[PDB]
């Protein structure tokens, strides 16, 4: 009795996820040391 | 060594090097060979990611 | 052994038999494809392709020459028990017309209601 | 398993285009990033003496 | 020694060196000479295998 018969029936076969690093890079505020900030809602 | 009195520094962050030479066996009439690293060529590898 | 201290010579002890020969691997051309547990004539070998190949992959044709339950018959032809059974690869179906078709076995159980026939598989002649 | 299933994750996309006062804002989007797929084979060898 | 700044280092993994100069002797009208190492030549030897 081949294992290939049970290949398609993924429900019967145990499922394990291939652990891997997924995501996207975190962006950062590079400018800040250069610029001097002035904050005022009325500009 | 200081070629022409030019102190070259040691490379770092290379924790280890490995040497995978070829492997071979003539089982029966047919010859089966696991290719090794070619002479000269090399591979700088990031580990276990 | 490389870099051994002294020269040496080796002698090969030949032996012809290499595998049981129950199952042969074949490579699938463009027009060929396989499903699990089904009969296929590939590269002049007939037998049960024990896995799914689609194309380009190498697949296991199992040729133990045992009794197999296969159906897939041309139901117009009546398969009596004991008849010689041929594979028509143009239609990809069993038959008993022979002609240019390949011979593949001999029928044990005749065509029952479900078009299910048990047949012994002949060698790869 | 014979084949190990892939991971999945979701991300969004937006751009902050320059906004004229009369501009109609342009919406973002989402997308799915799926991991890779790994499978395990069988090797075997023997003798007959 | 340092040569134009080229600090060549000593070669290691050389347990011992030997100088097999010849050995000559005149027997009558004939001279028999075990030729030594020819000048300007050298041989690396893996010991006693």
From TrEMBL, chain A:
Q: What is this protein called?
A: Uncharacterized protein
Species for this entry: Clostridioides difficile
Question: Which stretch of the intact protein is present?
Answer: 57 to 99 of 345
From TrEMBL, chain C:
Do you know which InterPro entries this protein is assigned to?
A: Phage_VT1-Sakai_H0018
Q: Which superkingdom is the protein from? A: Bacteria
Pfam families, sorted:
Phage_cement_2
Record's protein name: Uncharacterized conserved protein
TrEMBL record, chain D:
Q: Return the protein name.
A: Uncharacterized protein
Instruction: Specify the species.
Output: Clostridioides difficile
């Amino acid at each position: 009795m081949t294992f290939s018969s049970t290949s398609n029936l993924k429900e019967l076969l145990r499922k394990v996820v291939l652990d891997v690093e997924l995501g996207r890079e975190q962006v950062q505020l590079l400018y800040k040391p250069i610029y001097d900030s002035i904050a005022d809602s009325n500009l | 060594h200081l070629l022409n009195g030019s102190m070259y520094p040691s490379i770092k962050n290379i924790s280890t090097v490995i040497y995978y030479d070829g492997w071979e066996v003539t089982v029966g009439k047919k010859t089966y060979s696991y290719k090794g690293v070619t002479p000269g060529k090399g591979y700088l590898i990031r580990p276990k990611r | 052994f490389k870099g051994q201290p002294t020269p040496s010579t080796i002698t090969q002890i030949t032996r012809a038999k290499i595998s049981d020969g129950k199952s042969v691997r074949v490579i699938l051309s463009e027009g060929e494809s396989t499903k699990t547990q089904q009969f296929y004539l590939i590269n002049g070998f007939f037998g049960v392709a024990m896995q799914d190949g689609e194309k380009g992959d190498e697949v296991t044709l199992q040729i133990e020459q045992a009794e197999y339950e296969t159906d897939n018959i041309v139901t117009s032809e009546a398969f009596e028990a004991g008849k010689l059974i041929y594979w028509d690869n143009t239609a990809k179906k069993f038959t008993t017309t022979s002609a240019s078709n390949r011979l593949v076995g001999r029928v044990t159980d005749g065509k029952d209601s479900n078009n299910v026939i048990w047949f012994i598989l002949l060698p790869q002649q | 398993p014979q084949v190990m299933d892939a991971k999945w994750a979701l991300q969004g996309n937006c751009v902050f285009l320059e906004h004229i006062e009369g501009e109609e804002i342009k919406f973002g989007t989402i997308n799915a990033e799926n991991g890779p797929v790994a499978r395990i084979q069988t090797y075997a060898t023997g003798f007959e003496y």
